[PDB]
């Protein structure tokens, strides 16, 4: 069965839910849930969401503490409904998919797991899970995580780094790296060949090659010139420009950390949750300028070079249809005279 | 085991808890439980106390059913505790007794139902449920109610009137009269000889006697001439005077109804509770007279009219004490040449 | 467009939301909407639903106000969602179906009002507007009530009242009486022929046909012999026996009426909303009898009889299937020697 | 000093704040005022007002007693602010003005009385008060009752009724007429010889006069031929006609007892305040006639006679000033051929 | 007397409430407090804990600000109530004991300072103000703290560190090194020989001896070779091992700074509170390991080797008893072949 009192339990122990045997007082006042540990009260949770508290509270002490995707990609991969387990969003600090079934009932509208209403559903299984590649065999619509390989499908190859309760991560000890499968009408999918967002950020931005780490140290020009990058106009695409009071393109985390490395600023998150690219409100302590809503994008610099390079230079002002964490990401590009004059994922 | 989810199943079929076992979805919302019957939401429980709203819910639900004594009755005998059972006052909409032992654990602050901080409260208990005499013969300061008889005490009889599901009544299908004993420090209490409050309401008041019936029905002056009352003053103490924008008099439930068939008025309870003296806040919509605060006792009238021949008229302004409902009230009762100036219940 | 100040000025001048122009100041605090009328806040609304505020008072603005067939009508038909119009449950009060399409985008989860995901959705047509007929035809699964006729479509006669603005009658200005179509997977149904219940309440019982004023007026037992029914045993299957503190029998409004007009008693709805059966926590006031539970269903007494007349009294425990407002309700019908030892909707 | 236990001990002795010493525990939980009584939380107030908790308990203890007049003539007569005294309003069961001046500090935003932000507020004084009369004399823009008379100024008659505690009467042991000034600008002024609304209502409704006892005695037709009133149509005007879904006319108070007093039907009152007009959702129980909006005012209806009858009939299409409680409200009056085709108040 | 103004005044000038005079205005919304500087409302104080939030607010406000005992030594000494003062738990946001005797009388469940209900409290006593002393001779169980030293009593040293306004330090200005003392029964104790934690944390973890110093600055091996340590097993019950997704041993906070120094990760703290063993949920960064649950207890490492030196090696799976904080705290020492297979305090 299911209880507050025994999740609340679990929660004190082993801070999530196993599904031991043992209840605990609970206590429960304006969106928190609090307990009384030897005969004081302490609070085990505080609903952030719009869901009742102890439906929210059970969702959080049922959320899944192995390495996961990043809900981003679960988003791009359309995944609307988890399969006997709960995925918790760090950012929005609330369950990625609001309904579950194969978890509890209540939550969900669905009649059933495969039900009328439930058919367009796209489900997610955790191949780690026994069963799981199973009921995947025998789902409609539905995206799989394996640890390892699974016969008689072809993989296809996710990002190195992974969720792990909260933190994004590479992981030695654990196995951040799965294969993916999609199976929309049943039917296998050819998952396209896409690039992957990095997920860093400015307070903790570490290069990730070489690259990377000459765009950090080496200065501005001659960095420019050095990997002959000077027809392509990197100095506002990439480095930033702050002549003026309105911000001036600026759409690469590698650059905002090469900028906020010398003088600090401030970013602005007006929507908080997880996306491949992130609209910012940007603000240069510095110089005083400032963009309304700046949309960043983290690749790879190996990676955002490669790009730029595969494209050609005859459009004047071009929409490019890039794989990015297998969603197509649309990159405005106006070209002038043989030069890159923008380029930046268009709003 | 204690689950909400038992709890609002319980209530949903039988409106109380039994113990059945089951489970229905709930949803709490802003000290309100809701449950989804046929798929929509509706409310089971609105949380009116000071409590958690679990808390209260499951208190609420674990309500005792059978008829009751009113509060006023356990408040005069002392009662700290029930033991193994919930008294709802549905005056306040909470529970009568805030802490609860011998039936949870957080309820109560004392340790445990023997330990010190325990022992000199006064436990109740009910005689209709098995065991509970033994436990009042084990108890240090307790009171029992028992339907019938118990051998080797003294019984006192009390009430012919009960609560049940918060309605007061005379029973004769159930038996609202119980046997009362009380324990000090092991030691059987004898309880005094006492009167007890009618517990009638204004609105539906109904006489119980042949003289309540003459005083609704005879004119007034011929009423106080016909019964030998002249001397003794219930053309205020009990008529109530209205000449004034101060009210007078109407320290009986009998004239404030006696009143109230000639002409509605308003009874504004500032302090909704259950009491042996009831201060009210009156409105008379005829005359426009009102008194800020007056006291009002609903004693019978024939045990009205027995107090007042029992005390003597020498004392110029005394204060006569009368045991109503185990509770030692004190009138004050100005008299003047040899018949009564005023006589209320002092406040 | 929608706004909430927009819906506020409708409400304060009409008290429901046409769609005229014009704009009101809001405040928003605690499940409340207030507008400042001449400089002072009037409370406009308040949230009982668990939805959230601006959603339920945009819902409740925009309610039905023409008569509408009752809750418990579309629930038997299994209507799960309205098709442009909002109907309020009144005993909930919050809206019957939480979800809304061809109203509102924000209220659904069904992507359109034509997919996959809304294919099992039974929706509700009002065919007093225009447009409504022909949406039930082009309609996968629906229901249709139309003030007249139309054709090509068989009737059926549904029950003689309906909910005008929360309040049920039977309409001479107003035609409360519809007709009923079913389509299920396409196909027109053959809707059953039923027993409608009358809808009525112990606060203002009114009898509606020769027996049941024979029924309120006669003496009890003068009754049963005068339409001779001896056989059948209304003495606990209508009439209530309150010889126990458990009440006996007493599964039908009118018996409740009958015993109500001698002395008042309360009927607490521990479950606040519609059904053809509604389970009531019953007490006697005057002999102090009462029920955990009590199945109360209010035929028409003539139907009643009509239904009690057709069952065969041979099998020992029979339950009887009958039509009553679109849906199939059980009794439980215990026949001993031939008599009707009990009778009443099995739990 | 003004503090919440202080003020709650008053409430719990008195019911509201007269300026006693001594002090009682306090708890506050979401908009409500608890205190403890005997060990047991009470309920002492419950917010509904917009404003803070501790501020609106603070207003409603300090609530006038004595007779006042009713909000509607205040706002009519322009108050914005009471000198000294606040004036609840039971039908928003909030303070009738917002800010207060002469009472409380931290409840109005003007910095100091008679200050150039506080220069056009019209205040209320209170004369049964003493000084008050003076603070008139040096007021600015001011309006007084008065109990009896001054000295230099012509009185000005209101109604007969006030409002004690919420309830509206007419009082032999109180007062309930006041003498009103207005003085703008310094400036005495001369106030209206205006009609004033009697503040009735259906469930009590009683009749004030000869031609309303008739009116609800004597059928309808020969009621309108009695008083020889044939020509201005009483049927749709005052009486109500029921014959269609759309209610028509029916603007008078004694129309709705008159229908009510037939057959009960229902008054959705969707801006719960007071003023002259009323605008009602009004709906016919028995035809199930309703009207989305009904503009109902309350005279006597020998005042209604009077007005009509000096009335000229020449205009067909008419809109009329008429002074009721202080203010001039217009009636809309089509009179086509000499007839009262329409007549009531213009929305 | 208090009233929330005046606390809320001195609050505004002081930070705590001394018991000057003055008041402000104060408002409160949702578990808030507010007053008005100059004009705008500004958060006084916001209720995190479970009480009232004007209860909790006078609490907050009369908190002790002179250096107090950390509340973990307090709960170790049993401690249940303070006289005269108010201990603040700055982990929960909270008082350290729900109920105050000496501060408030709407505090304490109990009905009186000494009472049969009161007995068996253990009280605290700050020997810093006068009379406490004497108050703690009168005692029946009680825990007195004193700066100094008093008469014809055995001291007993605590921690060097006190918490100074919710920071702990060790004080040179001030003296944060109190002598304790203990009467359960009426009878002074014998405080044992123990044990202190010393209270630090990663982000700002500094040594406090040599050994410590070692620990941080030499490597993995050199140190557990160089201080005799390679019998003990370092390596897992202090190091930490990271070879697998279940993290190992790591139970010192020692080392815990150790690791965090090399790469940092975070740690949940999923019970809020101060304890002398603290259970983290502990997630490693870079090699992507992860416990549940893993116990840290922070001794001083100089003392850490004392214990495990005067610890036999003898028995397989021992038990170990050791006096931390006036507190037996028990390690599981599972010893195989003579040498430390594993070691942490069990959970």
Same mark, same amino acid.
Request: hydrophobic fraction near 40%.
């Given at each position: 069965?299911?209880?507050?009192?025994?999740?609340?339990?679990?929660?004190?122990?082993?801070?999530?839910?196993?599904?031991?045997?043992?209840?605990?007082?609970?206590?429960?006042?304006?969106?928190?849930?609090?307990?009384?540990?030897?005969?004081?009260?302490?609070?085990?949770?505080?609903?952030?969401?719009?869901?009742?508290?102890?439906?929210?509270?059970?969702?959080?002490?049922?959320?899944?503490?192995?390495?996961?995707?990043?809900?981003?990609?679960?988003?791009?991969?359309?995944?609307?409904?988890?399969?006997?387990?709960?995925?918790?969003?760090?950012?929005?600090?609330?369950?990625?998919?609001?309904?579950?079934?194969?978890?509890?009932?209540?939550?969900?509208?669905?009649?059933?797991?495969?039900?009328?209403?439930?058919?367009?559903?796209?489900?997610?299984?955790?191949?780690?899970?026994?069963?799981?590649?199973?009921?995947?065999?025998?789902?409609?619509?539905?995206?799989?995580?394996?640890?390892?390989?699974?016969?008689?499908?072809?993989?296809?190859?996710?990002?190195?780094?992974?969720?792990?309760?909260?933190?994004?991560?590479?992981?030695?000890?654990?196995?951040?790296?799965?294969?993916?499968?999609?199976?929309?009408?049943?039917?296998?999918?050819?998952?396209?060949?896409?690039?992957?967002?990095?997920?860093?950020?400015?307070?903790?931005?570490?290069?990730?090659?070489?690259?990377? #780490? %000459?765009? $950090?140290?080496?200065?501005?020009? !001659?960095? /420019?010139?050095?990997?002959? *990058?000077?027809?392509?106009?990197?100095?506002?695409?990439?480095?930033?420009?702050?002549?003026?009071?309105?911000?001036?393109?600026?759409?690469?985390?590698?650059?905002?950390?090469?900028?906020?490395?010398?003088?600090?600023?401030?970013?602005?998150?007006?929507?908080?949750?997880?996306?491949?690219?992130?609209?910012?409100?940007?603000?240069?302590?510095?110089?005083?300028?400032?963009?309304?809503?700046?949309?960043? #994008? %983290?690749? $790879?610099?190996?990676?955002?070079? !490669?790009? /730029?390079?595969?494209?050609? *230079?005859?459009?004047?002002?071009?929409?490019?249809?890039?794989?990015?964490?297998?969603?197509?990401?649309?990159?405005?590009?106006?070209?002038?005279?043989?030069?890159?004059?923008?380029?930046?994922?268009?709003?």
């Amino acid at each position: 069965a299911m209880s507050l009192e025994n999740v609340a339990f679990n929660v004190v122990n082993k801070g999530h839910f196993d599904g031991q045997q043992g209840e605990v007082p609970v206590s429960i006042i304006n969106n928190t849930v609090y307990t009384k540990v030897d005969g004081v009260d302490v609070e085990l949770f505080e609903n952030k969401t719009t869901l009742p508290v102890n439906v929210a509270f059970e969702l959080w002490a049922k959320r899944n503490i192995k390495p996961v995707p990043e809900v981003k990609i679960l988003n791009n991969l359309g995944v609307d409904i988890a399969a006997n387990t709960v995925i918790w969003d760090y950012k929005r600090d609330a369950p990625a998919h609001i309904s579950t079934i194969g978890v509890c009932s209540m939550t969900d509208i669905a009649k059933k797991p495969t039900e009328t209403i439930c058919a367009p559903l796209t489900v997610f299984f955790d191949g780690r899970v026994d069963g799981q590649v199973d009921l995947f065999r025998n789902a409609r619509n539905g995206v799989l995580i394996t640890e390892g390989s699974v016969k008689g499908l072809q993989p296809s190859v996710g990002p190195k780094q992974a969720s792990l309760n909260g933190v994004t991560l590479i992981g030695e000890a654990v196995k951040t790296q799965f294969n993916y499968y999609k199976k929309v009408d049943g039917v296998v999918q050819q998952l396209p060949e896409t690039y992957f967002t990095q997920s860093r950020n400015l307070q903790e931005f570490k290069p990730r090659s070489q690259m990377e #780490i %000459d765009f $950090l140290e080496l200065a501005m020009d !001659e960095f /420019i010139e050095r990997y002959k *990058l000077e027809g392509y106009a990197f100095e506002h695409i990439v480095y930033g420009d702050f002549s003026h009071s309105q911000l001036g393109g600026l759409h690469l985390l590698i650059g905002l950390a090469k900028r906020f490395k010398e003088s600090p600023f401030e970013l602005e998150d007006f929507i908080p949750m997880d996306s491949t690219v992130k609209n910012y409100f940007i603000t240069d302590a510095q110089t005083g300028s400032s963009k309304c809503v700046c949309s960043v #994008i %983290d690749l $790879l610099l190996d990676d955002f070079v !490669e790009i /730029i390079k595969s494209q050609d *230079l005859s459009v004047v002002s071009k929409v490019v249809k890039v794989t990015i964490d297998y969603t197509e990401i649309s990159f405005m590009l106006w070209c002038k005279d043989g030069h890159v004059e923008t380029f930046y994922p268009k709003l």
